[PDB]
Design a protein around this ligand. Structure first.
Ligand SMILES: Cc1ncc(C[n+]2csc(CCOP(=O)(O)OP(=O)(O)O)c2C)c(N)n1
Ligand SMILES: Cc1ncc(C[n+]2csc(CCOP(=O)(O)OP(=O)(O)O)c2C)c(N)n1
Ligand SMILES: [Mg+2]
Ligand SMILES: [Mg+2]
Lengths: 667, 664
């Protein structure tokens, strides 16, 4: 078959699957099929029988609405994705959801859909390849060597996150990143000139990318020539601008947004088959086409060759090879359990009153000696977030290439989605920090990490009005509660240096999802814990101060407000009242405990509960109920020194005691 | 005094005010003082005695950490901002908070701090000036004509939102937008080459801006020359790239991130004074420097000249002039109360089972006939969000310049912060739509509108698993609850075309803060309402179905789930149980009602409550407590037809009734 005939197999599988589903986007798959045929058949290094081969090239479909493009490519080249799977497009519990989801189909490298995060994940994947190569490759043993390929569209380039990711990609000289731009002059609102008129070539040249302009996206020889010059450029990422016709082959809907996101219809599909010269019924692919699309034989030989290279590498570098396999698998070092425990116990036995952001740095310093896979960073806030340790080596294009730290610049969304790509790639545990407030810039990347069950460590410092004079644009109020609502994210707001080391430990051990670690600017007093209390911190909430017998009142506190809760409990106790203090470093972790443990912390029979947190109050009714009270925030902050703000907003022993006594008096 | 001596007044006030607070950022004010002297003394058209002069130029400090720069300028040029105010920098209730706040000091045009949003607000103000000029100017009567000036630094240019805002600004040809880039090679991590190496000039030329390269930021003559060329360019926004030395004047910390964000120290301040030849004690500005900095005489003449132009305009176009004054003040038209009421009563009388996104478009259509100040838009989703009405005139650089709609492209964050600038400018009520999921892209701009108490209307469609097959990356679950947590935002989730029209009405009428209006893709059944029920919808929650006497079970539902709550209540009432259905289209609005009203709707003695909402369940404990139940979500969605998703996730009458019996 001809290259165009092979590409048409994608076009027809796409429009037939959308039609059977009565749902989906036929246009971009049809527009990009010729580019896909060249890239997948001539260049992409992959093995359909092992989609987890460590040295495979990574392909990312950033215009994720064109999901039938990747589904067709995976089916045609030999992956474990069947015609029956394509017939279940957009159906409940199928392998082929409306937007491609990591973990659902073999060979989908990332979950896309939200525009701009695809290319940003890919930037992270290319950073991880370059850094892993810098850490593990040796002379004669280039065991890390693979490209990162991206398809992207107009929406992706309009999104601000594309500017964050691609500006950084150029600075870091990601020569193995090659992106194909689907330049079809179409978005949902119509022909894009009215709202999108960048000179995109000049924009990307300004980032330090190589740009190959004006490629005919339906001419295989041109796509091939451009890909060759893209691969020959070793120092810069490359953008190949492909001129395509959206919905190529449709006589009445091509070149128009009418083909972007609706079924073509039975009549138009017939007219398309004829304009394409495609004579086979829906979901029928001739055996000849499967034979020429198959990547099984080329892929198996590529991996067997890499396995032989790795075998020889392991003889020369036995510890590197073991570390490679360990880190790529995501397992922790065998001494991790004992050294992290010993560090946490040392802190419990050597009290220090420090800011939890300092405790965070101390934890990084200790754990980084055990975890060479740490790949840390900050969005231009290293000296405020305290993310550097004594062994930090900031990565640059030609310096510290096997380093372990990224100066992300002022790019919270880009950093967060890059970290997702780093986590997806394997070999690293990424962490990256900013101020808690600017979680809101990166919000959807955090949710994406949770949806993809990726171990990405989101570090946030300056967590409340405790930060003081920078004022209400910076002082978080509702941000912690908002992070707590993200399914499959575990949010930690530790109350001293010990809870801070335990939150880091729990985040590192959480391999099926991300964590958010929230730290303070101001000093926090360390709480006393018995061995059993120390063991219970990782359960998310535990009894910190207890009375003899059933409590008449329970204080629930997190983070910097735990000392206040303890002091108010002391005052009430000196009046003969029986009060319990529960510290709740992670509401998410506590919610997962069995009902016996939760009842032992918050007994159902004790309904007089006071929650204390310098955050939005509405969150806490889940734990205090109608008979409880929340000592929280219900407004934006103010610019003033922190001690005056804590008094202004009621975080005083007098106020807490007074509010507690009101519910004890049933008022 | 020389120009440099006048600029040094900014430098010494900045560093002395930061030193007294023991907090703040001296470097950028010190780095930009010469630029600010030129722009404010030679070019800025403004009146310190009336910071609300409608035709004033707009200045925006996008690198807002340098707040002492704008406070010094305001103090020096004669605004109502005193030395005593600068002495209260960063102190409780001062007019000089650590980042400039709109309304806290006269002459501050927007609240900055979150990097990138200042320039994006300024793109919004430049769009509003251009569009308002297109609507109101007449031959011989150019009553709208003013520039938008921005200071911005490396952080702003690194942020993705700057790419959204400046791309659109070039496309719309905002010739009166002029930005000065504080190109000082410094950010908090240090010298920026290791993480920021853009060819910024070529980047902005790719957006269609004019770029003046390599201006010496400490040479008043070059700054003046660059600004003249920026003003001469009428068709494109201009970026003036000013090479500056952060902390200019400090011998030990200039050109270093050491001067970015901490007091210089008493000793370093003394050496800086010596290096600058500055001989006056802290907070002492000689009378001669005040006289030469004063904008009072120039500004009063400029406003008087404009008042005379407006008087001539009002003589020729009395109705137009009265519309200008009404729309700039923010007051609604006199017939608004009656027209909106008649529209809502008409919908209650002619039931239709339509998607609330279609109900939203119908409301836009009816209200836009009454509100010429509407400036609508969508982030590349006009056909899905349904934001166009029959009178929509999409604004372009040279077409529909007096239009009323913006194709924002795929730029949710930039859209939202541009809308904030449009609201700050005056003359418009901006609304803008995207899918509910992608408010997470625009999150902090929504918060900033609430912080600034701006009437910005954030429209969201496709609000639940109800959108169906696009799957869990698009299906909101926790987004509505997160919107509800934002102080001073009112979030509405209406259950039918009638609640949809009332939600738009209340958002339009809310002058002191923003609204989020959340609409469905799937059809919603209209509910029966008496005249008193119809009137109570604007109280945020109300009794929709009531039993006789005290109920033993209260259903609380919102949006698309109210019909399910009605259906389950009818099944339970047919069994003899006393059940009430409460529709709660806005939790935030309801929370602000007086105690008597709230008790009338949710009596405290009825503790058996079931909340129903296709969103994160944990939010609703505030209203149901320990002994209630939530028919909610606690996971991500799935890619499948909507009808199957509602069954899969338990949004069925049988499931709701089962959970109601668990507490009865
Ligand atoms: C952040 C975000 N905003 C909006 C959308 C909705 N959306 C999906 S595709 C699309 C149009 C973008 O067009 P383009 O990328 O050029 O694709 P084409 O129509 O050419 O296939 C939009 C707005 C989204 N997926 N993500
Ligand atoms: C979105 C956002 N992220 C982070 C910050 C914190 N921050 C304030 S200033 C700054 C450094 C930016 O440097 P630049 O704008 O070049 O300022 P300079 O030091 O030159 O005055 C950062 C990261 C912020 N205000 N907003
Ligand atoms: Mg397109
Ligand atoms: Mg700078």
């Amino acid at each position: 078959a001809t290259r165009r005939q092979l590409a048409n197999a994608i076009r027809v599988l796409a429009m037939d699957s959308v039609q059977k589903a009565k749902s989906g986007h036929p246009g971009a798959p049809m527009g990009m099929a010729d580019i896909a045929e060249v890239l997948w058949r001539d260049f992409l290094k992959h093995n359909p029988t092992n989609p987890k081969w460590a040295d495979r090239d990574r392909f990312v479909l950033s215009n994720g609405h064109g999901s039938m493009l990747i589904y067709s490519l995976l089916h045609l080249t030999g992956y474990d994705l069947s015609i029956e799977d394509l017939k279940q497009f957009r159906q409940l519990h199928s392998k082929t959801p409306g937007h491609p989801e990591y973990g659902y189909a073999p060979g989908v490298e990332t979950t896309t859909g939200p525009l701009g995060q695809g290319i940003t994940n890919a930037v992270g994947m290319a950073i991880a390849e370059k850094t892993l190569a810098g850490q593990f490759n040796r002379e004669g043993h280039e065991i890390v060597d693979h490209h990162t390929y991206v398809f992207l569209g107009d929406g992706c380039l309009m999104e601000g996150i594309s500017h964050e990711a691609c500006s950084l990609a150029g600075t870091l000289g990601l020569g193995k990143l090659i992106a194909f731009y689907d330049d079809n002059n179409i978005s949902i609102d119509g022909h894009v000139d009215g709202w999108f008129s960048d000179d995109t070539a000049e924009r990307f040249e300004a980032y330090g990318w190589q740009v190959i302009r004006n490629v005919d996206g339906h001419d295989a020889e041109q796509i091939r020539a451009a890909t060759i010059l893209a691969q020959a450029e070793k120092g810069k990422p490359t953008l190949i601008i492909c001129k395509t016709i959206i919905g190529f082959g449709s006589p009445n809907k091509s070149g128009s947004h009418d083909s972007h996101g609706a079924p073509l219809g039975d009549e138009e599909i017939d007219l398309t088959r004829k304009a394409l010269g495609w004579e086979y019924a829906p979901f029928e692919i001739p055996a000849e086409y499967y034979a020429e699309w198959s990547a099984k034989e080329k892929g198996a030989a590529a991996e067997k060759s890499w396995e032989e290279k790795f075998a020889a590498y392991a003889k020369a570098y036995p510890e590197l090879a073991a570390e490679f396999k360990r880190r790529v698998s995501g397992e922790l070092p065998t001494n991790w359990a004992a050294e992290s425990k010993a560090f946490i116990e040392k802190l419990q036995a050597n009290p220090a009153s420090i800011a939890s952001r300092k405790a965070s740095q101390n934890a990084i310093e200790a754990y980084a000696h055990v975890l060479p896979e740490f790949l840390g960073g900050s969005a231009d806030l290293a000296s405020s977030n305290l993310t550097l340790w004594s062994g930090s080596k900031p990565i640059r294009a030609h310096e510290n290439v096997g380093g372990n730290y990224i100066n992300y610049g002022v790019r919270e969304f880009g950093m967060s989605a890059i970290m997702n790509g780093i986590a997806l790639h394997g070999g690293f545990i990424p962490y990256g920090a900013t101020f808690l407030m600017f979680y809101e810039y990166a919000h959807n990347a955090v949710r994406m990490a949770a949806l993809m069950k990726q171990r990405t460590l989101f570090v946030y410092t300056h967590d409340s009005i405790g930060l003081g004079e920078d004022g209400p644009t910076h002082q978080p109020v509702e941000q912690t509660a908002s992070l707590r609502l993200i399914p499959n994210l575990e949010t930690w707001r530790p109350c001293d240096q010990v809870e801070s080391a335990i939150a880091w430990q729990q985040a590192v051990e959480r391999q099926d999802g991300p964590s958010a670690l929230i730290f303070t600017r101001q000093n926090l007093a360390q709480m006393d814990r018995t061995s059993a209390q120390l063991d219970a911190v990782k359960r998310g909430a535990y009894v910190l101060k207890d009375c003899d017998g059933t409590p008449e009142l329970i204080f629930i506190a997190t983070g910097s407000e735990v000392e206040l809760a303890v002091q108010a409990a002391e005052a009430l106790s000196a009046e003969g009242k029986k009060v319990r203090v529960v510290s709740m470093p992670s509401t998410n972790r506590f919610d997962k405990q069995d009902a016996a443990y939760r009842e032992s912390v918050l007994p159902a029979a004790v309904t007089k509960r006071v929650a204390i947190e310098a955050g939005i109050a509405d969150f806490w009714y889940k734990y205090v109920g109608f008979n409880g009270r929340v000592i929280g925030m219900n407004s934006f902050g103010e610019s003033a020194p922190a001690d005056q703000l804590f008094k202004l907003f009621g975080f005083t022993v007098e106020n807490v005691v007074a509010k507690a006594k009101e519910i004890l008096e049933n008022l």
